[PDB]
RNA sequence: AUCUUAGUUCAACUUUAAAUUUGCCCACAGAACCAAAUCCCCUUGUAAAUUUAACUGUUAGUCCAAAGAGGAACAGCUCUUUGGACACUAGGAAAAAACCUUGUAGAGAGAGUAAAAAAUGAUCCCAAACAUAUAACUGAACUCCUCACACCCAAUUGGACCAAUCUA
């Protein structure tokens, strides 16, 4: 578990999965 | 260096600008040797550029002498008691043509380190800051955690 | 090893998305590039300082132009992370033998006459 | 210690270019003409250039000699009298 | 929507609306019409501007002096006029350009009065080790411009 | 070559039992 | 500094880029005649007329080339019928 | 002895003259008066970069005080007067906010203003008439 | 290559002067049977390259990314290869040759930016603090601005000046 160069740590960051929100919550709607 | 220098204030002679502007210079006087090798630009400054500048500035006094016998050099007097020598030998006359223009351009002032590029003598209009400018006041002028 | 990159040409191709995204058009292509550098080629393998040295792209910002074809985009491909690349527009045409001493370039990227 | 902490204001300036370089992208995707269109429109433009080099290159030799410098040096004792 | 009210509802700073433009404008009006009249009457006294020059803003009043460190080829005492007024402003208005004002607006007069060659600066450049040593004088020239007047018209 | 087209071509190895 | 507004705005990022404040003329003298230009506007404004010219340069040879294209296109598809006789 | 110097006297005090104002015995022994000289020339030299920083520093902090004084942050005050399409720079408005504290006061509205112009159009729908001071004028 | 690895000679690289005309980048085509890329040239962007005359100097360097061989796939390990940086300037990551940003040099009491902030065992803990006022601002010798310009590498090489002494 090798750290990695810091540019590499950077790309790893702002390539990081997003999920996309739900439209509601589902504890107060179904 | 500048801790290792003198130094001054921004500054003019006598107000010169604010009536009427006058020269400074006053007074110059070249010593040119009439044989020296070191006296040659001087020799073509006088012979074909010191009628010229004398006319193009008729406030100042120019004095031209050959007893040095050697070496020459320029001595400018100013208005206000400054005098200023520099060395004119081994110079080309366009060398001694711009540092002589350069002697009458300037105020007699020392060249040392202006500590302001900008002196003003009223720098305030709407009144120097201090502390209870934009300060507000209170009824019957109270202090904090007063009663009466 | 660190290689010379050949970049796949199924990058460079606009998709319906993105020509509305940028001001663009398929048919009816621009002239010329007015292209600047922002970064620097230090740091870089030399096959890019050389490639800048050529484009005149030496000093910083700087904005300098070049034809649209694909003998230079060839070379624009190898730096096009160390500049950004507008397309010049010509909203008053070419100017004439009179009017290219009073041209200028806004920072939009249109050259004009008389400011 | 050697790992490190990638901040918000560096992700930021990568999408920053990021997003440049995905214009440059675009801009790249439609050349005015094509491989075979362009072959040759610049090749007097070329020539001539090269040939400015050529002649300039082919063009160096010492530079002449006037008496009048020579003579000028008697200057240097030239005197009032 | 409604929500009831809690610590972070309604955001911690207030609802800022800003008056209506028709109204406003006839304010601005007002306020400039006076502004013209303090003008015209002389309600003024000593003036000052933020004159843009060679390339820097300086705060600059009647009488007082200025250094610019470059020569500008006039003689000595010839009177010169400073466009690029930022600001000028007196006891009780002062006015703002966007980013200029106007050529007609304000007028400042300046005059050469010195011109000379600033004192020695040193250049050393310096490193360990290497043998690198070497030693630089500079003189850069500058010119002494007095201001003699801001004057300003009623032209709003 | 092996990044052409024409790679390949050569082979007869596989046609012998 | 608001370059990020003001490239929004169609201006330039650097208030000493182009604009009122960097082009026009610093002074004029008391009477009213100009001053001779400053240095620095000489050096833009030859600088942005090398950079039009380049401009119409390379427009006008990459013009030039689309036509001979079409030259050699007509040459090569139409000189072609003139062995389809006899 | 064919050639020997006779002038290093003047070679030294070309060197001790720039010393006289140091502390030890190396203001007047040329074996350290000239290690130190050469470091404060260096050090003269690359001090120019920091005056300008410096300088600027300052006329931030000033600023910040001045725009404190009136409810007013200074990213506030400077990414609002520019939206505004005033130039004035750091120095000026430092000197304003010391020597000309109702004029600051003016500018330091005008910045407050714009601030709410940009809020309330930003909260709106679409491209409403835009402010009052926040209208662009063209070169 | 060397009784040679504490050195020398040749080459490669560097410098100066001189001659001439192509040099670099580079698509399409092309390079075997038994993955990164590489080679080669029409154009195109460029202005350099080859050749000749004449000398010295360096030579088996460190770190980082990558692909391999040796020691685990470790021992901060020996070696080969592609690239970068250092031994040159400057700003950042705390101090910081080797990471990130940046080069061609001067004056300015002007301006715009680049990189750049953490999340959830043995002398003595170690910045201080802060949960919620609109996101922009700050930030270089990079760039722009007014003026001036030969005026920030080791070894080496070219050039312009010159202190003091003797002689004509
Ligand atoms: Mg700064
Ligand atoms: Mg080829
Ligand atoms: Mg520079
Ligand atoms: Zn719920």
Known sequence: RRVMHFQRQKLMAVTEYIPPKPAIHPSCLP | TARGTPSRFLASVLHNGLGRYVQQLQRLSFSVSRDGASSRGAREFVEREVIDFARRNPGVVIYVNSRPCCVPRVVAEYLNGAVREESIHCKSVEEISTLVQKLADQSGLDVIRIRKPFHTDNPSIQGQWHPFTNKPTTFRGLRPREVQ | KFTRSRIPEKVFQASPEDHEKYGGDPQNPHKLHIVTRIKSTRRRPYWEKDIIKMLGLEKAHTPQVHKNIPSVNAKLKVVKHLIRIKPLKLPQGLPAEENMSNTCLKSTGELVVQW | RRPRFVSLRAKQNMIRRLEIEAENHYWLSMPYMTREQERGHAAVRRREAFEAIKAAATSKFPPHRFIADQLDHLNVTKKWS | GYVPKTSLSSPPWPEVVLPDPVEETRHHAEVVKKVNEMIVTGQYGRLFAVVHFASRQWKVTSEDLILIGNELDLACGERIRLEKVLLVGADNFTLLGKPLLGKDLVRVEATVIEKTESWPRIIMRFRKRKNFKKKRIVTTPQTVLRINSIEIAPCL | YKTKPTHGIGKYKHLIK | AGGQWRLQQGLAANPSGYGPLTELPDWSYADGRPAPPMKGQLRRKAERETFARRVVLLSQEMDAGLQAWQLRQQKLQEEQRKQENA | ?139
């Open chain 8, 1 to 139: 002895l064919r050639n020997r110097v006779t002038d290093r006297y003047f070679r030294i005090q070309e060197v001790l003259k720039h010393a006289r104002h140091f502390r030890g015995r190396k203001n007047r022994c040329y074996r350290l008066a000239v290690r130190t000289v050469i470091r404060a020339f260096v050090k003269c030299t690359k001090a120019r970069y920091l005056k300008k920083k410096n300088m600027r520093t300052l006329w931030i902090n000033r600023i910040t005080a001045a725009s404190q004084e009136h409810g007013l942050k200074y990213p506030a005050l400077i990414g609002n007067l520019v939206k505004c399409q005033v130039e004035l720079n750091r120095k000026v408005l430092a000197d304003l906010a010391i020597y000309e504290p109702k004029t600051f006061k003016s500018l330091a509205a005008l910045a407050s203003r714009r601030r709410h112009e940009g809020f309330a159009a930003a909260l709106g729908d679409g491209k409403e008439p835009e402010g009052i001071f926040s209208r662009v004028v063209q070169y």
